[PDB]
Short mmCIF file of C-alpha atoms in Angstrom, two decimals:
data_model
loop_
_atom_site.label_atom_id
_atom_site.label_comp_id
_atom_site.label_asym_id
_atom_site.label_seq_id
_atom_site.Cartn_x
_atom_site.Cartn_y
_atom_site.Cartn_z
CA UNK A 1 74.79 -43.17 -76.79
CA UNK A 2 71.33 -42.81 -78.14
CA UNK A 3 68.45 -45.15 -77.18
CA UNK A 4 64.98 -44.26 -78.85
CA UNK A 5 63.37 -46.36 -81.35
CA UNK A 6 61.28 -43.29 -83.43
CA UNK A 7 59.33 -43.51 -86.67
CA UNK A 8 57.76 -41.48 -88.94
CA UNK A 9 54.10 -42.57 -91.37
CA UNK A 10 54.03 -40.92 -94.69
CA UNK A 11 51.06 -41.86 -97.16
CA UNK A 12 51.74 -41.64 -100.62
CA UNK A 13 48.70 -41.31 -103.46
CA UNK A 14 49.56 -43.24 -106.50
CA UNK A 15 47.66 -40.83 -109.01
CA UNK A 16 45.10 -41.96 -111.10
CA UNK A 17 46.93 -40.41 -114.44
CA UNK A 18 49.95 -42.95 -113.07
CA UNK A 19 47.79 -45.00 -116.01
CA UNK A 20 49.16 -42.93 -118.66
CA UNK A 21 52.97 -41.39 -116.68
CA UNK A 22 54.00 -44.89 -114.91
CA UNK A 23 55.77 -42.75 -112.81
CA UNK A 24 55.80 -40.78 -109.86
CA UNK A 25 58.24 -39.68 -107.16
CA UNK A 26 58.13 -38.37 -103.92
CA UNK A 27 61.02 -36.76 -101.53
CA UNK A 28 59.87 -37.30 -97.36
CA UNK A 29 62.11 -35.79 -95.10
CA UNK A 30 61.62 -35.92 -91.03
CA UNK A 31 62.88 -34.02 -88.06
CA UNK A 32 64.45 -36.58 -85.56
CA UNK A 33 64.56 -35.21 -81.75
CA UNK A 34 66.30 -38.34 -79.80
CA UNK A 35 66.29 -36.39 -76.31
CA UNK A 36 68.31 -40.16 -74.93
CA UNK A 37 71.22 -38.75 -77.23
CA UNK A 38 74.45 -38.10 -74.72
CA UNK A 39 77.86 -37.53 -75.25
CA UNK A 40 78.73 -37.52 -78.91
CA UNK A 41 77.07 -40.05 -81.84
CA UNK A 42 77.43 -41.03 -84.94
CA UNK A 43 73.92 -41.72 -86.97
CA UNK A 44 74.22 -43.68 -90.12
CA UNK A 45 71.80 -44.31 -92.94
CA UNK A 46 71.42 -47.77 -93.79
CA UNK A 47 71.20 -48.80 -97.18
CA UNK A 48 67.40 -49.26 -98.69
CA UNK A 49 65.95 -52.05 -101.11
CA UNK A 50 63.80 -52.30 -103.72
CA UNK A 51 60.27 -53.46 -102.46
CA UNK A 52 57.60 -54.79 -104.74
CA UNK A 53 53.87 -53.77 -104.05
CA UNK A 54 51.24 -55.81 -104.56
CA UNK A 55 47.56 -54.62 -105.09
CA UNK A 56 44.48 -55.97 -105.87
CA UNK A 57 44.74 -59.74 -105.46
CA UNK A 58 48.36 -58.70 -106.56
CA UNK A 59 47.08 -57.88 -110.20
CA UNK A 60 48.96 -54.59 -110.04
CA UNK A 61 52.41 -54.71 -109.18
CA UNK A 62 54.40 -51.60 -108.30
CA UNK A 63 58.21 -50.99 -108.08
CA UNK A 64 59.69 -49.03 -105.20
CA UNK A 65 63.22 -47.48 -105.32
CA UNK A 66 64.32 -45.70 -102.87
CA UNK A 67 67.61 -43.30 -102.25
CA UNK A 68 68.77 -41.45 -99.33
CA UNK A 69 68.61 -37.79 -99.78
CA UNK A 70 72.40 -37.37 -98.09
CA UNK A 71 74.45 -40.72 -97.94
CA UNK A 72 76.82 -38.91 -95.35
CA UNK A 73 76.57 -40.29 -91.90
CA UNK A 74 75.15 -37.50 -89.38
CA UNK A 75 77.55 -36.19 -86.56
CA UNK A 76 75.81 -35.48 -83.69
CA UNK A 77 78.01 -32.80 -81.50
CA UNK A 78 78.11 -33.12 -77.51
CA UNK A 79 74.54 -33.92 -76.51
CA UNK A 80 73.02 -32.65 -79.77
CA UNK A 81 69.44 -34.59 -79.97
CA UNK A 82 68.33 -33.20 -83.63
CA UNK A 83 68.58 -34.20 -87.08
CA UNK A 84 67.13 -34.14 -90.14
CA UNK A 85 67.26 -37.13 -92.77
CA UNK A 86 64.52 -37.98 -95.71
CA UNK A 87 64.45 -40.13 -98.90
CA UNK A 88 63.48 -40.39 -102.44
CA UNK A 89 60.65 -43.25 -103.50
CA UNK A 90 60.01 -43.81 -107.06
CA UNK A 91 57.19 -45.45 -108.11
CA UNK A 92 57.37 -47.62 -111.85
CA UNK A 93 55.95 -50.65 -112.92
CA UNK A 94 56.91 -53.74 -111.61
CA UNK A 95 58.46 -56.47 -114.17
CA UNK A 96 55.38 -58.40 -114.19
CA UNK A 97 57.52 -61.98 -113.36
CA UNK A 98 58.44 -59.70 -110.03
CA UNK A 99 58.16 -61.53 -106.66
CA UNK A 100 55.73 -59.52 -104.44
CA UNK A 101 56.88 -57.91 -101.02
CA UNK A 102 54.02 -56.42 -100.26
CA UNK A 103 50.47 -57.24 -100.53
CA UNK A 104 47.09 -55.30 -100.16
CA UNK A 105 45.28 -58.12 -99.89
CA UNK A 106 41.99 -57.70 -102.56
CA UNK A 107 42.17 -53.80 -101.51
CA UNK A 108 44.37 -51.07 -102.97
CA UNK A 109 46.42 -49.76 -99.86
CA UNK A 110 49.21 -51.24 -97.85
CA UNK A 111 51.76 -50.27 -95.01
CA UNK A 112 55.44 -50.58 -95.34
CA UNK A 113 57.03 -50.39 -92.32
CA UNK A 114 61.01 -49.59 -92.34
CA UNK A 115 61.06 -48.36 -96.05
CA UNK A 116 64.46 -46.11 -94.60
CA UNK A 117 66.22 -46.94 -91.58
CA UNK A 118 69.03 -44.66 -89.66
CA UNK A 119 70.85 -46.28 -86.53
CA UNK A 120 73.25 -44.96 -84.20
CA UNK A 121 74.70 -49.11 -83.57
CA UNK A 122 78.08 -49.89 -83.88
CA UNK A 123 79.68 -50.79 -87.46
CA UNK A 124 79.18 -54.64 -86.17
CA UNK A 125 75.93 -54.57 -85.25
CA UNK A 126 74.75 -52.48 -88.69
CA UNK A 127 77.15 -54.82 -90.52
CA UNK A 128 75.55 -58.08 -89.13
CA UNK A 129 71.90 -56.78 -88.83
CA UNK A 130 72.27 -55.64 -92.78
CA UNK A 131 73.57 -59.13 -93.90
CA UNK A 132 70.61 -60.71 -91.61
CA UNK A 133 68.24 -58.66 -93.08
CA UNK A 134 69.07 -59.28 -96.59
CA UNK A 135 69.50 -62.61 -96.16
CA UNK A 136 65.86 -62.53 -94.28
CA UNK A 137 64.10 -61.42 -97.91
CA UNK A 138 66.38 -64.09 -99.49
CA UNK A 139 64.67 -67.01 -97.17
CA UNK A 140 61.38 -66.19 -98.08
CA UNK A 141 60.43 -64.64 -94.63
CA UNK A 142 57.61 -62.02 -94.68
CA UNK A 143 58.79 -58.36 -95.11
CA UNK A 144 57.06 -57.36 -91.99
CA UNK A 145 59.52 -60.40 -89.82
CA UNK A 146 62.54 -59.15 -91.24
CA UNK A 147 61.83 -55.75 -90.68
CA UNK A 148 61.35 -56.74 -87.00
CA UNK A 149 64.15 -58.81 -86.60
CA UNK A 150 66.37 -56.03 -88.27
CA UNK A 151 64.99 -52.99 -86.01
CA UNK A 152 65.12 -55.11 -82.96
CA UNK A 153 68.77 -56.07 -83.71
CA UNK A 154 69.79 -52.58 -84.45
CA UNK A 155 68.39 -51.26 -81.21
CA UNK A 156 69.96 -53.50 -79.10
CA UNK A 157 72.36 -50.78 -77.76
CA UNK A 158 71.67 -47.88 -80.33
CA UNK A 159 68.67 -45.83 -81.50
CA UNK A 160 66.98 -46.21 -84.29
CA UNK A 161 65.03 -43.96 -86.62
CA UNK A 162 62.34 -45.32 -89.06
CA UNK A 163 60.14 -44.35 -92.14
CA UNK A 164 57.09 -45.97 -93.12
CA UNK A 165 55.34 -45.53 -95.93
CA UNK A 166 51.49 -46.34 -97.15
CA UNK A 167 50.98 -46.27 -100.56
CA UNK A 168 47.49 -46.05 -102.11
CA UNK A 169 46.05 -47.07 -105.66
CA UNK A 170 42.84 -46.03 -107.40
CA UNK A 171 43.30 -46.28 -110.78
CA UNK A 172 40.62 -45.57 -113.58
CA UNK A 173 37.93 -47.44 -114.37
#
């Protein structure tokens, strides 16, 4: 059994020259130390979703992909607390007619909480907490509620193990 509820804040700088590339990419990786882990565990990534940013009164819209590094599930041996996981985020620009995720407000910077998500729960509850979740964005729900309701499900008897992201705009002018 594990039981911590860890996170990790990265803050990525949409370059200004992003203008001209409409691309950029970034690869985060974090060092997990659960010291609740006991016994042996199983930690499994769950799969990611395309989020689309908002900026600016939403008159910039960015597309965020994101891939697991490793798609293999991490084995944790006999009370073994550390792990390493991390993810891919490319940034593109959104499809215009795009539904907006996220929103800076009138300012060019948000949080994303829970862009990547590992959990040590039980195939049910990652089963049932995956289908909730995506049926969460579905409904209309803010991101930031089904985020919530999808961490707090996870953890219910498990550890889970978060990545947030801010992203930041200035472009040109």
């Amino acid at each position: 059994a594990c039981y911590s509820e860890l996170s990790v804040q990265h803050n990525l700088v949409v370059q200004g020259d992003f203008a001209l590339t409409q691309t950029q990419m970034a690869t985060y990786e974090h060092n997990f130390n659960d010291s609740s882990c006991v016994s042996t565990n199983t930690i499994t990534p769950m799969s990611p979703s395309d989020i689309i940013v908002g900026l600016y009164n939403d008159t910039i819209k960015l597309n965020l992909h994101f891939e697991w590094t490793n798609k293999n599930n991490i084995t944790l041996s006999n009370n073994q607390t550390s792990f390493t996981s991390g993810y891919s985020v490319t940034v593109t620009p959104a499809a215009s007619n795009a539904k907006v995720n996220v929103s800076a407000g009138g300012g060019g910077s948000v949080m994303i909480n829970g862009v990547a998500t590992l959990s040590s729960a039980s195939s049910s509850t990652r089963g049932s907490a995956a289908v909730q979740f995506l049926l969460c964005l579905l409904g209309g729900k803010s991101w930031d509620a089904c985020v919530n309701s999808y961490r707090n499900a996870l953890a219910q008897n498990a550890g889970v193990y978060s990545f947030n992201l801010t992203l930041s705009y200035n472009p040109i002018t």
